[PDB]
């Protein structure tokens with residue numbers, strides 16, 4: 075049952091976000107600072123979904139505000155997509171984390187499939203509210219949330235996907251999460267960035 079009873083009977087994003095602040099649909103609300111709902115408006119043609127709010131997002135109250143979000147901004151701009159026209163969110167809405175002694179940040183921990191499924195009523199509410207033409211799935215957790223737990227992002231780069239149990243039948247494009255592009259050898263980071271731009275352009279060219 076997960077988050078389902080916490081989701082109000084409205085498509086209004088402000089009302090949904092306020093209700094998500096009270097969600098206890100899995101255990102992640104306990105240690106997180108606050109729920110981080112998606113950001114953007116219901117006229118958005120492109121929805122983008124990451125894994126979870128990270129350390130910076132958990133305190134900003136907004137998605138994609140840390141280093142991964144700044145890299146995503148650079149890729150969006152290169153793809154000539156206006157971020158203000160997107161609806162951006164995450165598969166789960168509370169930050170799951172630990173700390174290491176001497177660390178500079180809280181370290182994100184992978185949501186279990188159980189947590190993803192518990193939080194999915196919020197994602198369905200967002201998709202029903204926004205009616206996107208295309209959904210960009212950033213990373214394995216988000217892609218699996220809609221495409222199935224066995225789905226491999228690495229095996230379907232550049233492909234427009236469609237699955238029948240997604241409400242509205244939007245196009246789906248699964249790509250690497252921007253956090254994966256922050257570190258590594260220079261030429262591999264550069265090739266990976268170009269690939270993210272490519273996938274964003276595929277999504278933007280839908281219809």
Ligand code: SF4
Pocket residue numbers: 076077094097098099100101102103109166167168192193194196
């Ligand atoms: S992660 Fe999702 S289901 Fe879990 S408590 Fe937070 S909003 Fe609710």
